[PDB]
Design a protein around this nucleic acid. Structure first.
Lengths: 192, 194
DNA sequence: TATACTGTATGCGCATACAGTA
DNA sequence: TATACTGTATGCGCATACAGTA
């Protein structure tokens, strides 16, 4: 049930038209737009999308294309797990650089820089991170958030708190994946 | 140019159909849903809305009815301009209001390490729910002599204390009998992005 | 002429089936 | 049979104009 190259276009094209002109496109509009000389090319490109279950075609209704598949989500506890947990319509282009997901922080390791137990962490899904940055790493399937400081094979993860000590790692006898870069924080306690 | 009652209905019907079926309605659909026996009634009620500039009609395009309809960041504020003194705000970040509890109304750019020990850092965008009913113990955005302050509230009638979550700061004491004091709103959460 | 419509009427607008050709 | 199409037809689905009646 995977989308082809040209089928991805059509579906991306519908999303645009609905988002741009507030209404779904006609077959002839899809053809026109993409370059087909036959509206039937759109028809079958649509019929397929309906079978691969990404759209719903309404019989008779002009512009009767309803999208189906359809804001940054939080993972909760474990860096991405299919397909938990929450769904929150936040601005991704609010952080620098753009956030991809949220992680529910756990513990007071990064206290001294305003990262508290229970915060929602804004993270960028990348692997190129540099020294001194704040990062989400996964030491043996165990997701952790700290300040990075690598030296070849010796990777040091520092906490922002004086009661916590550096977590030293050696990739030669431990698995270690960078989940992403910490770009911002969102707190939503309803505390009294 | 305000809308007539029957025209307010028609506009609400479209608003719904779009939100219920993913696409604008036809003339016949409007006539059907509202009880007209003639789609021309839908046509004119639409043409009227087009004049009143609330919708746009696309010629020839079936269902060619286009409608013509987030949180803000308060600027550090010069004295004598209110909440919300205007143009102070500095921009709008289109977040989720129903994310926080109670629903957040605006963001204030925090200033200082007074609320450090609870994760409120100099330069965080604080989310705020505008209200004047804030209980003691809660965190509030108050205004001592047009001077927006953020702290933990402890009000004892006429003597009002503003408590900071930091050990190097002292509690700010206010006496309403000789200083103005506005509860601007309730601190419902924090947002950091720089 | 301006709202609020019922009724009738054209006719492009559009969805959609039945052919090809790669 | 499944993509990707070009081409042709068949008709309703639709916007809209032209009267009427309150």
């Amino acid at each position: 049930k995977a989308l082809t190259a040209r089928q991805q276009e059509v579906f991306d094209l519908i999303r645009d038209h609905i988002s741009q002109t507030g209404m779904p496109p006609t077959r002839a509009e899809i053809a026109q737009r993409l370059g087909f000389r036959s509206p039937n090319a759109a028809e079958e490109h649509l019929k397929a999308l309906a079978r691969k279950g990404v759209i719903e075609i309404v019989s008779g209704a002009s512009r009767g294309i309803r999208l189906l598949q359809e804001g940054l989500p939080l993972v909760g506890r474990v860096l991405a797990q299919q397909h938990i947990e929450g769904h929150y319509q936040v601005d991704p282009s609010l952080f620098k650089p753009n956030a991809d997901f949220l992680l529910r922080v756990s513990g007071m390791s990064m206290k001294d820089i305003g990262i508290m137990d229970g915060d929602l962490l804004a993270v960028h899904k990348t692997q190129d991170v540099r020294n001194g940055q704040v990062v989400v790493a996964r030491i043996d399937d165990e997701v952790t958030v700290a300040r990075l400081k690598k030296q070849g094979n010796k990777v040091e993860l520092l906490p922002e708190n004086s009661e916590f000590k550096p977590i030293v790692v050696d990739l030669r006898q431990q698995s270690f994946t960078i989940e992403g870069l910490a770009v911002g924080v969102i707190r939503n306690g309803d505390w009294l």
